[PDB]
Amino acid sequence: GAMNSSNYAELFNNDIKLFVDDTNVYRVTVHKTFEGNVATKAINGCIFTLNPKTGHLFLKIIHTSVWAGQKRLSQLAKWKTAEEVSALVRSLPKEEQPKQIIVTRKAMLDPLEVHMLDFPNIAIRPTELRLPFSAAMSIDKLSDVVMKATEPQMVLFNIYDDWLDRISSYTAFSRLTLLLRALKTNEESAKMILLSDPTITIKSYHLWPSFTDEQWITIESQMRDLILTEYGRKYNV
Amino acid sequence: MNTVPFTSAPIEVTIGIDQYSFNVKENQPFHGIKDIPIGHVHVIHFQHADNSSMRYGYWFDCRMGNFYIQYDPKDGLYKMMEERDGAKFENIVHNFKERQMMVSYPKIDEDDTWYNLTEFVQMDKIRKIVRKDENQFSYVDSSMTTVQENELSDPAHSLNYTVINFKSREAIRPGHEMEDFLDKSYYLNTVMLQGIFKNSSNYFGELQFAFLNAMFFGNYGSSLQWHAMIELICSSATVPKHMLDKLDEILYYQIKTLPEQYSDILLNERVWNICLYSSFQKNSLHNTEKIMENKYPELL
Numbered sequence A: 001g002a003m004n005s006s007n008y009a010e011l012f013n014n015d016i017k018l019f020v021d022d023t024n025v026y027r028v029t030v031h032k033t034f035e036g037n038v039a040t041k042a043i044n045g046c047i048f049t050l051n052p053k054t055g056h057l058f059l060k061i062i063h064t065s066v067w068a069g070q071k072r073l074s075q076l077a078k079w080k081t082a083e084e085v086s087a088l089v090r091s092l093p094k095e096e097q098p099k100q101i102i103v104t105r106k107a108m109l110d111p112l113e114v115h116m117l118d119f120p121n122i123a124i125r126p127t128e129l130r131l132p133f134s135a136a137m138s139i140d141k142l143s144d145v146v147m148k149a150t151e152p153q154m155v156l157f158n159i160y161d162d163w164l165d166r167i168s169s170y171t172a173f174s175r176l177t178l179l180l181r182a183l184k185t186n187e188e189s190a191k192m193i194l195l196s197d198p199t200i201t202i203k204s205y206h207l208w209p210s211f212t213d214e215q216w217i218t219i220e221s222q223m224r225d226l227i228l229t230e231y232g233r234k235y236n237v
Numbered sequence B: 001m002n003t004v005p006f007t008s009a010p011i012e013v014t015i016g017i018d019q020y021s022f023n024v025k026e027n028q029p030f031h032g033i034k035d036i037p038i039g040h041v042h043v044i045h046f047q048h049a050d051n052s053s054m055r056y057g058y059w060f061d062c063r064m065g066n067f068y069i070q071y072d073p074k075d076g077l078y079k080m081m082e083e084r085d086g087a088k089f090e091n092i093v094h095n096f097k098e099r100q101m102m103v104s105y106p107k108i109d110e111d112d113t114w115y116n117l118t119e120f121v122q123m124d125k126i127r128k129i130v131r132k133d134e135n136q137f138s139y140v141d142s143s144m145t146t147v148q149e150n151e152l153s154d155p156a157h158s159l160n161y162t163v164i165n166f167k168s169r170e171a172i173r174p175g176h177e178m179e180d181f182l183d184k185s186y187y188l189n190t191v192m193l194q195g196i197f198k199n200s201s202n203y204f205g206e207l208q209f210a211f212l213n214a215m216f217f218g219n220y221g222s223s224l225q226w227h228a229m230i231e232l233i234c235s236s237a238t239v240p241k242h243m244l245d246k247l248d249e250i251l252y253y254q255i256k257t258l259p260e261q262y263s264d265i266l267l268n269e270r271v272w273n274i275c276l277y278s279s280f281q282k283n284s285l286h287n288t289e290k291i292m293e294n295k296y297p298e299l300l
């Protein structure tokens, strides 16, 4: 059933699984029309499909042309997500296909279940967990490839860089959620923390800076401080 | 007018005949039911006074044979049987009428209720849902499960209603996933009506039979089937106009007949609120919406 507070180390076992987050598929800016009405303009979006064990990220870029002449776009976006995830699964060799797909928003369940009818053995699961994947577009390299796209495109990343050489998946995911939780609560301060030290750089083939083990502990502690800070600034504590 | 005689009534029992019912006491001199209208299927049903567990009964059509009821003290139930000897049977019946040992099917002449509940119900279709080919009548009870219920266990005692499942390859055309899930017209009109039922009359017949088994026996799988068949129509944007008007009449009489005190268990809040207020046909069921709002405004 639902992945919750009681059954999450299952993320790091050896059954292939994918998280699917659709919160950046349909993106718009709201603006005023010359007549003083309100209108939206879509911008490029992305499906965030992630193997939490390996770090492999299947970033399907959603180009604004997919919305042209369509109605009820927020509803369509869930079905387009499910169509693309199904297409991804079918494109993978059998031994790479997931056993489970966990959707971060419950409104994706029926669209994904219907698109995956051909895969009765792939379990489609919700999660009570509140995962920060909406903040993926705060990662500069992911935002850049989404906005630059001129057509539909799939781009593959490892969201853990080389961390798995040194830490377990459990810890890597832990770090990713903390980074994303920080970028989601105060993007400016989070990015400040990550790049404050110009001697630590992001490798061309990486998403995050090349922190030593010790520097990651410092960074991680600064991110927790930031999250707690914003929690106090928000609720006044 | 036809007659279903009873050999005897050795155990106290509430007997139903269609939407009517009466109490018979242990060893009361009861010998059956006369004046049964020809032209309709009928159901004769039972609930024992000492164990209300298992409502059970028999669907039958008096045009298909001479049927009677006889208590079996080994299996502990009133059983329907067919008498092939026509003169033996007329003989039995005539004697019991002369002694006035029979209740009269108590039909008010103004009243079209039973016709309206069974308009599309055919014995031949009942016998395909309830499989027991050596008998011309069909036994149903409270506990019998449906083919669909069994998929999710004795196949000979099952209700073989047409399986309807909105998240199934049958319901969903490859490449029309969103369209077909949000608008079930393909599944209703091509798969079910053209393909399986052949026509709307057979569809309505199974819908009506499912309702009657839900109401008369508390059969839960029947209630599920009734609601699925309603939902499939209401969730279709394209429905022949004659079907929508007939569906409104069908549902109106079903809601009108339902006991006021069983609405908590026989009516699915989600389906009805969705059908009357959210679905494509939200504005097409005027009579049903009116009786539902006046009789069961709580459910809504």
Ligand SMILES: COc1ccc(N=O)c(O)c1
Pocket (backbone or CB within 6 Å): A008, A011, A129, A130, A131, A170, A171, A173, A174, A177, A178
């Ligand atoms: C190490 O696994 C997890 C799983 C879920 C989380 N939050 O919802 C988390 O931060 C870590």
